[PDB]
Amino acid sequence: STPGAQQVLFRTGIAAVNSTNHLRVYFQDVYGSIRESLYEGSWANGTEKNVIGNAKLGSPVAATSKELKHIRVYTLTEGNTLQEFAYDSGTGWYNGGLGGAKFQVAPYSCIAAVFLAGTDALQLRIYAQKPDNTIQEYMWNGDGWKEGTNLGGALPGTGIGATSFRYTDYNGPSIRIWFQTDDLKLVQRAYDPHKGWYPDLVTIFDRAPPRTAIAATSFGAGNSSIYMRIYFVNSDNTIWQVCWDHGKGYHDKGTITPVIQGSEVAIISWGSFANNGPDLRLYFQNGTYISAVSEWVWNRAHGSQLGRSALPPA
Amino acid sequence: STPGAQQVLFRTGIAAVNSTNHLRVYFQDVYGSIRESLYEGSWANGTEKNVIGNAKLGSPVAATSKELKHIRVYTLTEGNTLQEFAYDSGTGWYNGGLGGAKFQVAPYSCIAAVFLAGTDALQLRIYAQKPDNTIQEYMWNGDGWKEGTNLGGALPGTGIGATSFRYTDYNGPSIRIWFQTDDLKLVQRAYDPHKGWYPDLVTIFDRAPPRTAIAATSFGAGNSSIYMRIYFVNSDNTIWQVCWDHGKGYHDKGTITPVIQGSEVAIISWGSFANNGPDLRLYFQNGTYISAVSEWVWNRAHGSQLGRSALPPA
Ligand SMILES: CC(=O)N[C@@H]1[C@@H](O[C@@H]2O[C@@H](C)[C@@H](O)[C@@H](O)[C@@H]2O)[C@H](O[C@@H]2O[C@H](CO)[C@H](O)[C@H](O)[C@H]2O[C@@H]2O[C@@H](C)[C@@H](O)[C@@H](O)[C@@H]2O)[C@@H](CO)O[C@@H]1O
Ligand SMILES: CC(=O)N[C@@H]1[C@@H](O[C@@H]2O[C@@H](C)[C@@H](O)[C@@H](O)[C@@H]2O)[C@H](O[C@@H]2O[C@H](CO)[C@H](O)[C@H](O)[C@H]2O[C@@H]2O[C@@H](C)[C@@H](O)[C@@H](O)[C@@H]2O)[C@@H](CO)O[C@@H]1O
Ligand SMILES: CC(=O)N[C@@H]1[C@@H](O[C@@H]2O[C@@H](C)[C@@H](O)[C@@H](O)[C@@H]2O)[C@H](O[C@@H]2O[C@H](CO)[C@H](O)[C@H](O)[C@H]2O[C@@H]2O[C@@H](C)[C@@H](O)[C@@H](O)[C@@H]2O)[C@@H](CO)O[C@@H]1O
Ligand SMILES: CC(=O)N[C@@H]1[C@@H](O)[C@H](O[C@@H]2O[C@H](CO)[C@H](O)[C@H](O)[C@H]2O[C@@H]2O[C@@H](C)[C@@H](O)[C@@H](O)[C@@H]2O)[C@@H](CO)O[C@H]1O
Ligand SMILES: CC(=O)N[C@@H]1[C@@H](O)[C@H](O[C@@H]2O[C@H](CO)[C@H](O)[C@H](O)[C@H]2O[C@@H]2O[C@@H](C)[C@@H](O)[C@@H](O)[C@@H]2O)[C@@H](CO)O[C@H]1O
Ligand SMILES: CC(=O)N[C@@H]1[C@@H](O)[C@H](O[C@@H]2O[C@H](CO)[C@H](O)[C@H](O)[C@H]2O[C@@H]2O[C@@H](C)[C@@H](O)[C@@H](O)[C@@H]2O)[C@@H](CO)O[C@H]1O
Ligand SMILES: CC(=O)N[C@@H]1[C@@H](O)[C@H](O[C@@H]2O[C@H](CO)[C@H](O)[C@H](O)[C@H]2O[C@@H]2O[C@@H](C)[C@@H](O)[C@@H](O)[C@@H]2O)[C@@H](CO)O[C@H]1O
Ligand SMILES: C[C@@H]1O[C@@H](O[C@@H]2[C@@H](O)[C@@H](O)[C@@H](CO)O[C@H]2O)[C@@H](O)[C@H](O)[C@@H]1O
Ligand SMILES: C[C@@H]1O[C@@H](O)[C@@H](O)[C@H](O)[C@@H]1O
Numbered sequence: 001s002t003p004g005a006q007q008v009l010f011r012t013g014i015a016a017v018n019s020t021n022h023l024r025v026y027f028q029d030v031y032g033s034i035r036e037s038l039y040e041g042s043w044a045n046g047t048e049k050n051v052i053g054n055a056k057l058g059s060p061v062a063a064t065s066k067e068l069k070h071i072r073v074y075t076l077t078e079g080n081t082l083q084e085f086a087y088d089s090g091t092g093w094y095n096g097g098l099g100g101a102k103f104q105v106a107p108y109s110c111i112a113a114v115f116l117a118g119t120d121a122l123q124l125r126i127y128a129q130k131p132d133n134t135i136q137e138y139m140w141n142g143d144g145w146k147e148g149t150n151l152g153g154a155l156p157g158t159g160i161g162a163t164s165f166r167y168t169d170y171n172g173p174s175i176r177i178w179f180q181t182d183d184l185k186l187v188q189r190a191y192d193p194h195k196g197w198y199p200d201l202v203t204i205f206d207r208a209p210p211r212t213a214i215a216a217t218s219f220g221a222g223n224s225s226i227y228m229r230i231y232f233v234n235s236d237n238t239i240w241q242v243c244w245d246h247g248k249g250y251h252d253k254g255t256i257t258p259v260i261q262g263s264e265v266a267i268i269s270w271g272s273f274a275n276n277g278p279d280l281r282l283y284f285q286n287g288t289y290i291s292a293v294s295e296w297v298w299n300r301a302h303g304s305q306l307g308r309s310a311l312p313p314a
Numbered sequence: 315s316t317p318g319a320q321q322v323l324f325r326t327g328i329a330a331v332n333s334t335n336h337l338r339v340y341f342q343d344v345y346g347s348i349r350e351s352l353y354e355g356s357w358a359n360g361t362e363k364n365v366i367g368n369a370k371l372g373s374p375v376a377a378t379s380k381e382l383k384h385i386r387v388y389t390l391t392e393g394n395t396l397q398e399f400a401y402d403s404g405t406g407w408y409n410g411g412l413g414g415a416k417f418q419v420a421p422y423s424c425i426a427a428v429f430l431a432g433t434d435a436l437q438l439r440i441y442a443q444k445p446d447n448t449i450q451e452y453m454w455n456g457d458g459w460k461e462g463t464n465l466g467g468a469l470p471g472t473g474i475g476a477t478s479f480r481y482t483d484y485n486g487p488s489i490r491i492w493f494q495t496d497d498l499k500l501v502q503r504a505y506d507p508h509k510g511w512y513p514d515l516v517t518i519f520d521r522a523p524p525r526t527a528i529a530a531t532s533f534g535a536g537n538s539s540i541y542m543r544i545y546f547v548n549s550d551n552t553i554w555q556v557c558w559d560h561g562k563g564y565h566d567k568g569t570i571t572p573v574i575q576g577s578e579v580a581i582i583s584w585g586s587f588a589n590n591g592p593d594l595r596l597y598f599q600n601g602t603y604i605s606a607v608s609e610w611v612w613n614r615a616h617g618s619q620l621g622r623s624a625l626p627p628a
């Protein structure tokens with residue numbers, strides 16, 4: 001190991017945001033603080049000087065952004081309430097309003113977050129699990145934090161993935177979330193402006209490890225068309241990818257890369273098949289320097305390859 | 315799941331002690347409190363009313379006993395110092411003197427603990443990992459807590475298993491500990507009263523997952539003879555057993571039962587091959603009610619079988 005990688009909590013929550021290839025990665029250290037590593041031409045930071053807040057030990061860690069002008073990072077307090085670390089270009093980091101709403105969730109809740117796509121307005125949807133084990137949506141629309149739609153029961157401690165996109169022929173944003181049900185299947189729920197939340201749960205994988213990590217991305221929104229990727233940790237201790245491709249739907253799935261037992265996962269993407277893309281990056285723990293966070297890369301140039309072997313501070 | 319199961323921390327530390335088939339099992343709840351479940355002809359307790367103290371979330375949990383007259387449970391504080399919860403018959407539960415010593419360890423340290431075998435005196439050896447990644451022994455021999463022998467370097471965040479026994483032809487106790495080295499091997503170190511700590515590390519498993527759980531027991535101590543069993547979580551997400559049997563040494567090894575990814579493990583035994591024994595019990599998480607602690611059984615009559623599906627509070 002290394003002294004730096006020794007600072008990364010084993011099975012830490014991981015989240016990532018980006019503006020094309022300007023990347024930020026959030027993780028928790030062994031004392032419970034949440035740190036930011038970055039990629040701006042090269043990898044940097046992730047030290048005790050790069051802490052954006054503190055969270056309960058073992059906390060989920062989720063994030064979303066509008067490019068890098070606005071970033072929000074979501075974690076649990078000691079009292080099991082949702083909280084938010086916020087960055088706005090020209091203000092810096094501050095403790096965001098979410099904490100003041102005091103939304104109590106299950107102690108074992110995960111979190112996902114999206115800014116709604118296709119608008120310059122700052123509109124947030126956050127998803128977590130209540131003590132009754134239902135997935136609850138929370139909303140920010142300029143005018144305070146409030147509860148949105150409840151999306152029903154899920155496996156207690158399920159991972160939660162989410163993405164927002166805007167079809168080019170639609171008048172408003174779409175949302176897709178994925179989570180695990182009590183029968184251990186992984187499923188999709190969906191929101192479109194004309195149908196609200198579709199009533200049906202779409203199974204994407206028949207059987208996954210209980211409480212397995214779940215992360216998702218989308219890219220290349222066209223007219224009634226989208227590309228999506230969903231990642232989870234399977235029973236072979238590897239990340240699997242499930243693919244949605246326009247014209248084929250959910251058509252493929254298979255192993256991507258090995259990880260440590262119980263690794264968390266984050267995914268980011270940019271570009272499109274139409275313009276020499278997409279670019280995909282996964283972050284996870286595969287046991288490099290024992291406890292470092294590693295990267296995986298997909299691009300047009302080389303397809304599937306390992307990336308940065310060990311992120312800062314390793 | 316059940317409301318009770320849901321209180322149990324996912325990948326909680328687990329320890330157990332016994333007097334023959336009178337059993338106690340220790341685990342951490344989602345709020346960080348350590349709780350006791352018990353078997354006295356039937357399973358009971360494990361609730362918020364059976365809290366014996368509080369430890370940092372994710373803490374290792376270790377325990378040792380002299381029958382059930384004296385029980386000692388070891389965890390880590392928020393401050394990353396060793397602490398102890400103590401039970402003496404006639405006194406009940408109290409905060410033990412270990413915390414007063416303020417032994418600072420690595421944030422990712424595990425713990426093992428033994429009462430030295432074959433004496434009525436209360437002599438304790440505790441094992442943990444310091445910030446420099448060396449295994450340190452800490453000692454209580456009646457005149458306060460102090461540092462004992464340093465047993466050198468190990469994988470940062472290694473599991474630690476330990477046992478004490480006293481050969482019937484010896485006039486002092488023996489001790490064996492097991493842990494993982496930087497090369498991912500699982501090894502034994504050994505103390506006998508004539509050789510002190512043997513210089514050599516003996517390899518018991520070529521390669522195991524990083525920071526895999528490690529637990530050990532011994533039984534049937536005779537004239538320069540002993541039986542030992544060591545358990546860890548292998549890459550196939552099962553507990554594997556390694557056996558020391560008198561005559562054969564370290565001769566056999568294989569899977570026992572499936573567990574969740576990154577499950578912790580505890581072991582207890584009683585009896586011996588001479589007396590229609592031994593009896594073994596293993597505690598672990600295998601996904602029963604998602605987060606419940608499960609039991610595996612070995613006994614002469616029926617051999618290997620799953621035991622209590624879900625311990626209290628499940
Ligand atoms: C077609 C294209 O322009 N792709 C770039 C990609 O470069 C391609 O793939 C890499 C692996 C290398 O073979 C290049 O020659 C090839 O063009 C960029 O990746 C960076 O490439 C440079 C060299 O030009 C370095 O290898 C650098 O490490 C690569 O950065 C990667 O992506 C970063 C955003 C981080 O995730 C980093 O850890 C990765 O290694 C990328 C980044 O600009 O952009 C296209 O994909
Ligand atoms: C169930 C349903 O169809 N509700 C919509 C509501 O959608 C909300 O946002 C969507 C994306 C999703 O998260 C739903 O669960 C959630 O209820 C609509 O809310 C507006 O959505 C747009 C983006 O589509 C903006 O975010 C806008 O700020 C939202 O309106 C605000 O929230 C509403 C609940 C109202 O309180 C309104 O006063 C707010 O301005 C609304 C249209 O308002 O339509 C259904 O209620
Ligand atoms: C390396 C070595 O051989 N040291 C011994 C020391 O062994 C200690 O205990 C053993 C089992 C092991 O944990 C070692 O790492 C540790 O240093 C002996 O200590 C005594 O051990 C017996 C049991 O065999 C009793 O536990 C007794 O209380 C111990 O004596 C006390 O501790 C010693 C360090 C002395 O300070 C003594 O005055 C204490 O009463 C001693 C024999 O005393 O011999 C080597 O130091
Ligand atoms: C390509 C480009 O112009 N990128 C900009 C970044 O380089 C800027 O990063 C900020 O740079 C200043 C020094 O000029 C300083 O290093 C700031 O700490 C750094 O901010 C980083 O990026 C932010 C989005 C946050 O994640 C913050 O924690 C980081 O430290 C940023 C400033 O907003 O603008 C980019 O466009
Ligand atoms: C320099 C500047 O004016 N920046 C804008 C912020 O002030 C705005 O943040 C919101 O400001 C209001 C005050 O009217 C209040 O402080 C809100 O808490 C704050 O909202 C934050 O951002 C939201 C998107 C949420 O994440 C909320 O929980 C945060 O606390 C924002 C408007 O979002 O724009 C900045 O540019
Ligand atoms: C079925 C039965 O009663 N078995 C005996 C146990 O009850 C004894 O333990 C103590 O019993 C008293 C009853 O007056 C009371 O229930 C105590 O709480 C109980 O203590 C338990 O055992 C201790 C060793 C600790 O683990 C403690 O936390 C437990 O709650 C035992 C020995 O005292 O003997 C059984 O035969
Ligand atoms: C009735 C009675 O007195 N029983 C003995 C206990 O008092 C002993 O506990 C130790 O007592 C001393 C002197 O008061 C001091 O309080 C110690 O802290 C305490 O030691 C505890 O037990 C040890 C074995 C260690 O675990 C230590 O950290 C604990 O705090 C005990 C131990 O000698 O024996 C009872 O019989
Ligand atoms: C100590 C306990 O051992 C087993 O208990 C058995 C009982 O379930 C019952 O079958 C009787 C039959 O008379 O045999 C016991 O040995 C475990 O099942 C139990 O969980 C305890 O570990
Ligand atoms: C963007 C790429 O899309 C498909 O071609 C998949 O085969 C790859 O894994 C990658 O997700």
Ligand SMILES: C[C@@H]1O[C@@H](O)[C@@H](O)[C@H](O)[C@@H]1O
Nearest residue numbers: 543555557592594612618
């Ligand atoms: C005590 C028992 O010993 C041998 O029979 C092993 O095959 C069993 O797994 C058990 O350890």
